[PDB]
Amino acid sequence: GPVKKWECTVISNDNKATFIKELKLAIPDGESVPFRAGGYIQIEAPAHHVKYADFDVPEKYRGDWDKFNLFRYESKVDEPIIRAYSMANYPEEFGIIMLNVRIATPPPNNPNVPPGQMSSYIWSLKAGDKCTISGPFGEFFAKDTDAEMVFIGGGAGMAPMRSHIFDQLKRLKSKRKMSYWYGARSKREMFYVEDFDGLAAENDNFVWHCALSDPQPEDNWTGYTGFIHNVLYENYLKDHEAPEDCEYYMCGPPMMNAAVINMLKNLGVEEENILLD
Numbered sequence: 001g002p003v004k005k006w007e008c009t010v011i012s013n014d015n016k017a018t019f020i021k022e023l024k025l026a027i028p029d030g031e032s033v034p035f036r037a038g039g040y041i042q043i044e045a046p047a048h049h050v051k052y053a054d055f056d057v058p059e060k061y062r063g064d065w066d067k068f069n070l071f072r073y074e075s076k077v078d079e080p081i082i083r084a085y086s087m088a089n090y091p092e093e094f095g096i097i098m099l100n101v102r103i104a105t106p107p108p109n110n111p112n113v114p115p116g117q118m119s120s121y122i123w124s125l126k127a128g129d130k131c132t133i134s135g136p137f138g139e140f141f142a143k144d145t146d147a148e149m150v151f152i153g154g155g156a157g158m159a160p161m162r163s164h165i166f167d168q169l170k171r172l173k174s175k176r177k178m179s180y181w182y183g184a185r186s187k188r189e190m191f192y193v194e195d196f197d198g199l200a201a202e203n204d205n206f207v208w209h210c211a212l213s214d215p216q217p218e219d220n221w222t223g224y225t226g227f228i229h230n231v232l233y234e235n236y237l238k239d240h241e242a243p244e245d246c247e248y249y250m251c252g253p254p255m256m257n258a259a260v261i262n263m264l265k266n267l268g269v270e271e272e273n274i275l276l277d
């Protein structure tokens, strides 16, 4: 029994983006999971049946759900299952586990396949529910150097990026040069804006930027647009005197990971300085 297990209580499970919920868990007796930033826990689910029509999805985020009739879906799970989720809190955010969980719907080109089992279960959870977690685990840990760090995130990849960045600035009091580049579709898909604005205001070695690939009329957006690998290249790495000497930490959807890795490699960054997972 080397691995520990906690039956947690759901504090909240609010949408932060159209397809991402922030699951916040309270550890029993106020204790903390002894994890490292970049690490993960596992959630286990009992057998269950959930309906997407019962999810709490705010009107602000419902547009695509209505557009693609995503509330049609139901998920029946006959036997227990288990999956990993990355911590979004850093280790001195005690007493809690914060996760960012993307709902894995059936793909639009394959609309009658079963919905994602664990994420549909997690999206059914409401304040007061119980959630069993085990861990902690991980190998996506920061290197112990003084090298500049470039963090690149998309989607639910926000979670380990937040954990890493907060761990550096708050627990380690790092003075390393640090930037964070987050790509999202439109302004409603952004979140943790207060957290990262807060850190950038208080730490002259940290800056961050969001790029919107499809800003909406209501966003009145005048920030960066496009895909985050082009925005990072055009606005920072193209003129960087030694990009190969930075450490790049990233977590995003597969298409973002591939485009970023290709852009970094074409700049001469070696695989040893490109960290994922």
Ligand SMILES: Cc1cc2nc3c(=O)[nH]c(=O)nc-3n(C[C@H](O)[C@H](O)[C@H](O)COP(=O)(O)OP(=O)(O)OC[C@H]3O[C@@H](n4cnc5c(N)ncnc54)[C@H](O)[C@@H]3O)c2cc1C
Pocket (backbone or CB within 6 Å): 040, 083, 084, 085, 086, 087, 099, 100, 101, 102, 103, 104, 105, 106, 107, 110, 113, 114, 115, 116, 117, 118, 119, 120, 156, 159, 277
């Ligand atoms: C170390 C680690 C960290 C992770 N951290 C996070 C995190 O922070 N956030 C997060 O959201 N995820 C994270 N994940 C991923 C997570 O563990 C799950 O893989 C994710 O939630 C999807 O699992 P699921 O059970 O919901 O979907 P699954 O049931 O595994 O299904 C996956 C997808 O396949 C589709 N599908 C189902 N059946 C078929 C079929 N017959 N044909 C075609 N397609 C089909 C489903 O509709 C769904 O879209 C992490 C994974 C690892 C390993």
Ligand SMILES: [Mg+2]
Pocket (backbone or CB within 6 Å): 015, 016, 017, 187, 188, 189, 190, 191
């Ligand atoms: Mg949002």
